[PDB]
Amino acid sequence: GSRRASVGSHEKMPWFHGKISREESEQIVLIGSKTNGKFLIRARDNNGSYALCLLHEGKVLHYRIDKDKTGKLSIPEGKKFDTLWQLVEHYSYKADGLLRVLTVPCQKIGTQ
Amino acid sequence: TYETL
């Protein structure tokens, strides 16, 4: 297989930037969104926790995302998922609790 | 800073 065990912080992705802070992405959201549904998850790899960041109608939000000493990621008010891929994709469906469902990746792109 | 899901 050769593909590491746990998610090796799959930076590669828009709505998944394990670099941004929280504001940095919220200013980015400032750029894109409006349509209520834009979002971008953040998850580094060193120490701390992840957090979903989306925008409603002009009020960026953030949702702490962590597991439960079980190994699976989740959210207090949100839900419970395996990884940010499920909590994201899932939520890509609905809000599940967010202010509003998801619709688009917010964070920036790459190069050009 | 975490809205309530």
Curated annotation (Swiss-Prot), chain A:
Annotated localization: Cell membrane; Cytoplasm, Cytosol
Domain named SH2: which ranges?
15-106
Query: Where Phosphothreonine occurs along the chain?
Result: T103
**Phosphoserine modified-residue sites:** S49
Q: Where, by residue number, does the polypeptide cross the bilayer?
A: none
Tissue specificity here reads:
Widely expressed in hematopoietic cells (at protein level). Expressed in neutrophils (at protein level). Within the B-cell compartment, expressed from pro- and pre-B cells to plasma cells.
Q: How is it modified after translation?
A: Ubiquitinated by CBLB after BCR activation; which promotes proteasomal degradation.
Q: Name which cysteines form disulfide bonds.
A: none
Q: Which disease is it linked to?
A: Immunodeficiency 82 with systemic inflammation: An autosomal dominant immunologic disorder with onset in early childhood. It is characterized by recurrent infections with various organisms, and multi-organ inflammation that manifests as colitis, hepatitis, arthritis and dermatitis. Patients have a propensity for the development of lymphoma, usually in adulthood. Disease severity is variable.
What the protein does comes down to: Non-receptor tyrosine kinase which mediates signal transduction downstream of a variety of transmembrane receptors including classical immunoreceptors like the B-cell receptor (BCR). Regulates several biological processes including innate and adaptive immunity, cell adhesion, osteoclast maturation, platelet activation and vascular development. Assembles into signaling complexes with activated receptors at the plasma membrane via interaction between its SH2 domains and the receptor tyrosine-phosphorylated ITAM domains.
Quaternary structure per UniProt?
Interacts with LYN; phosphorylates SYK. Interacts with RHOH (phosphorylated); regulates mast cells activation. Interacts with NFAM1 (phosphorylated); probably involved in BCR signaling. Interacts with VAV1 (via SH2 domain); phosphorylates VAV1 upon BCR activation. Interacts with GAB2 (phosphorylated); probably involved in IgE Fc receptor signaling. Interacts (via its SH2 domains) with CD79A (via its phosphorylated ITAM domain); the interaction stimulates SYK autophosphorylation and activation. Interacts with FCRL3.
Domain commentary: The SH2 domains mediate the interaction of SYK with the phosphorylated ITAM domains of transmembrane proteins. Some proteins like CLEC1B have a partial ITAM domain (also called hemITAM) containing a single YxxL motif. The interaction with SYK requires CLEC1B homodimerization.
| The family this protein is said to belong to | Belongs to the protein kinase superfamily. Tyr protein kinase family. SYK/ZAP-70 subfamily.
Stated name of the protein: Tyrosine-protein kinase SYK
Complete-protein stretch covered: 163 to 265 of 635
